[PDB]
Write a protein that binds this ligand. Sequence first.
Ligand SMILES: Nc1ncnc2c1ncn2[C@@H]1O[C@H](COS(=O)(=O)NC(=O)[C@@H](N)CC(=O)O)[C@@H](O)[C@H]1O
Ligand SMILES: Nc1ncnc2c1ncn2[C@@H]1O[C@H](COS(=O)(=O)NC(=O)[C@@H](N)CC(=O)O)[C@@H](O)[C@H]1O
Ligand SMILES: [Mg+2]
Ligand SMILES: [Mg+2]
Ligand SMILES: [Mg+2]
Ligand SMILES: [Mg+2]
Lengths: 502, 499
Amino acid sequence: ENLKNEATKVLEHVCEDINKESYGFVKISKMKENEKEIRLFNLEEIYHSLMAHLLQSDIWVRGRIHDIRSKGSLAFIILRHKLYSMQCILDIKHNDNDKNMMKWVSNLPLESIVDIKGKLSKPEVPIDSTNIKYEAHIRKIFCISKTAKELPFLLKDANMKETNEIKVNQDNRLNNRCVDLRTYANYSIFCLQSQICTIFKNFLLENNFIEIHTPKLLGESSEGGANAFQINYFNQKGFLAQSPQLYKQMCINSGFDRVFEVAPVFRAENSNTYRHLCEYVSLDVEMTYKYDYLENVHFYDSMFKHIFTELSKGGKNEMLIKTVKGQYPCEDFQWLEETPIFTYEEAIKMLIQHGKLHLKEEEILAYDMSTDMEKELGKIVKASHHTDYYIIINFPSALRPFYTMYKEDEPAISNSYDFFMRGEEILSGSQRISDVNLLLENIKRFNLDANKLNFYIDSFAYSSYPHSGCGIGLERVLMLFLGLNNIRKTSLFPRDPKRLIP
Amino acid sequence: KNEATKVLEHVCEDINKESYGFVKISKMKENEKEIRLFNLEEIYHSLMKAHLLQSDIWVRGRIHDIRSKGSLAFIILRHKLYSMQCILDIKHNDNDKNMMKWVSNLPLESIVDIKGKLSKPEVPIDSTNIKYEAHIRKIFCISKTAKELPFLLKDANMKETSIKVNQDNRLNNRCVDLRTYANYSIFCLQSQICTIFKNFLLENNFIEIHTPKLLGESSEGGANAFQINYFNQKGFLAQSPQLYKQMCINSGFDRVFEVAPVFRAENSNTYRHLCEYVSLDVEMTYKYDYLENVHFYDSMFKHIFTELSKGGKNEMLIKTVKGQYPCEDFQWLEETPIFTYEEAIKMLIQHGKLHLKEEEILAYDMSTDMEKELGKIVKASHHTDYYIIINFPSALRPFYTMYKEDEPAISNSYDFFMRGEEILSGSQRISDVNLLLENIKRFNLDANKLNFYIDSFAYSSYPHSGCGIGLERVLMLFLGLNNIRKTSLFPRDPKRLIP
Ligand SMILES: Nc1ncnc2c1ncn2[C@@H]1O[C@H](COS(=O)(=O)NC(=O)[C@@H](N)CC(=O)O)[C@@H](O)[C@H]1O
Ligand SMILES: Nc1ncnc2c1ncn2[C@@H]1O[C@H](COS(=O)(=O)NC(=O)[C@@H](N)CC(=O)O)[C@@H](O)[C@H]1O
Ligand SMILES: [Mg+2]
Ligand SMILES: [Mg+2]
Ligand SMILES: [Mg+2]
Ligand SMILES: [Mg+2]
């Protein structure tokens, strides 16, 4: 059985001089012992340069073993980095016929990280797997991090467009999120999430906004205490912020004029749905207006048209979106140069007219449109206006929060607005009550405790500029832009009433 | 003779006919002509760095100061860090003494729309950085101050020396306090730091991530973590995104940053730390030497200082802060000094600040007071406010810090300092799952509760490093302010949860 122990020695071989040797496990320190300094490439650089310094001589490249197929005297490794994959071929006949090198390579587990020294060349029929259409012929291969554990599922299965033709279910993916995020579509999803944050902030900064950061530990709930997480804050009773609502208004009352925040909020929703989470990233805007709050509404509208335009343009966003759609197909998000705006009353009458809703004229003012009904409206507007994006305005005051300013001449109606993507709410906002006495009256009208809101209310007591604002769900915007079926696909480590882990 | 009160409280019912009064915004809409409403920032940038000078204009602002004498009233109008004097001379308003009475009675902080003519006086007053004046033709109040202010903004703007508006008074009245010229400027500079940080990282191929603050197990140690009941699960608030930013690198994202709150149940109430703050976090891979990333983080901060220190807007913001809170300009070198921890301690010993033998240096855990003493030494010897310490003792760093395999008492760790105080802490990470489990055991932590994090290393881990940065601390130390509560909008500390 000594033969088996010699074989074990080969399979476990640690390389001690990478100048003499062509394979083995190596500490990163020992690549310092190389006679030359190493210019190490990643696959993103290779893709963008090739799809001359890369084709001339042997190069060094690092990547994860996405796939490895042993075929006798040949072995085929697909290296992966981000979105990019490249085939690397070990041919024993080109490596002094070293059978132990092949034995060691065949034994490498998937997802292991290797540094390969090899020569790039363009084959006749390139692998259809790899978006790098060159192949590396391996001269040396060293493993700097060996996979230690059997994978919870295969990336080949996890990447598959889900059909009835192995599905990896959501629980398995979320439980092993650090493997799930390696699929091409999931990588692309979160690159796009970052893009949304960048476009949002850059548009606001170009329009003279400053970024603010307001606390999430509160003494009082921001949007209604029933769904606020409670905390013990040094023997005080505290809550997590459901929104930065109170503080962004306080900042406008303090003179900051145009503010935005990109930050977590926490909502103790006791419903476990496909489209909401208990923790999410709110994009909040608050700003003054001159004489009409519609000034700000048109501004928020231009902001979203800009987001859509920027998400839909350029090579890299196009590639990200196409990569998502490869696994999760959906028609491209559509919007108009003139966003359709409907009043709540008009929207109701449209739904009744299309036979989607039945109400007596008596029942129309108090009617509270369901999320399913908002989706039906989305379908109607998609058919009639050829857009996935529109605005509803003038909600009844009774259905909006206490800080929403009502129409002076028609108080049952408020100066409020929701924006919709594919028939689902992405943004909610309103003209704010900017008179401290009207604000106290509305707080009382809503049976809220003004004493507990004193720090907020007092911020209006030394003048208040006319102002409005909005709050936006980042994960929901991304989900609906891509047409994904669940908000857990656009939150990195989702939180819902059952899931605190990972 | 009660018509005087009706004058004082006058509500204007037609702005085309009248020249003063309280008005509803809807009433302004009744103006016969569309109103091009200017703010003081536009006026400053157009005039101080011609439409505004050939006609009556409309301007909105807050009444910062008001004085009247006879036929003249003087209003200082304020917006952001800009102020401009406006003058009512009722010889040019039909000698309407009632207008003078109504205007003179407006309370401070009231928001007014003024229709007037701009002109450049021979002698502009010194306090207004707009060196033009507005001669008032009409003035309407769209929001009247309702309550007496808790302190005068004139007092709150003064350099401290009789008058002093104390910190508790200010923070209990934060939305008034934030109107001082310095405080406005501080939080504009905070936003500048976030912008420069993100743009530098984006230009270097990073992506922004958002990771949860509701956790099943604390990220930096349970003694200082807030607990929460999460649907009858026992959880914590994140003290940092440490576990998740490493998990994102293990997931292949390669270069990530996060700008987000963290929560720390800090044992103490001190001038330089808070219980909630905004952490700027970076995590990235390296090729063969973690020092690659350290030099990168160093370039990031040099870039931040460079952009904060530039001419134009940022220079005016800094000047405005220093007007109330004077401090020497922040200085940094073209090449950042880097000291090992041992070198830093030996510098303290050489200057007589510490007495340690050689065999005691690595066991010594440098206090914040001694870090400050070191900052003074380095300012005197190297003429910089910014430097780096590397190679902290392993036993004094967190469990995820990789030690030097050939001298394990030392770690591949680093802190960055501004004016002698820590702004950044980070390290090469343990990226071998077996070494990670051993170090977790060595720090007597619970591998089972950290299982979701440990498991993220079990399917390979890239060589990687990272860092965490206190946003408010960076701003505080850049400006030389005496308290971190000056650089956090609504501060949280062990006593203060409100506002
Ligand atoms: N549980 C959840 N999961 C994910 N996204 C969610 C969500 N709940 C809401 N959102 C998203 O957050 C947005 C704002 O939340 S909100 O409608 O409750 N409004 C406001 O809060 C006001 N302050 C805003 C203002 O008036 O400025 C929604 O439109 C969704 O996109
Ligand atoms: N209570 C407080 N108030 C304000 N700022 C504070 C603070 N505590 C810390 N900071 C600031 O946050 C930074 C990071 O915090 S830390 O030193 O605890 N390190 C880490 O956490 C690792 N994960 C980082 C890594 O290794 O990536 C500090 O340098 C301070 O500037
Ligand atoms: Mg809704
Ligand atoms: Mg809503
Ligand atoms: Mg320290
Ligand atoms: Mg520290």
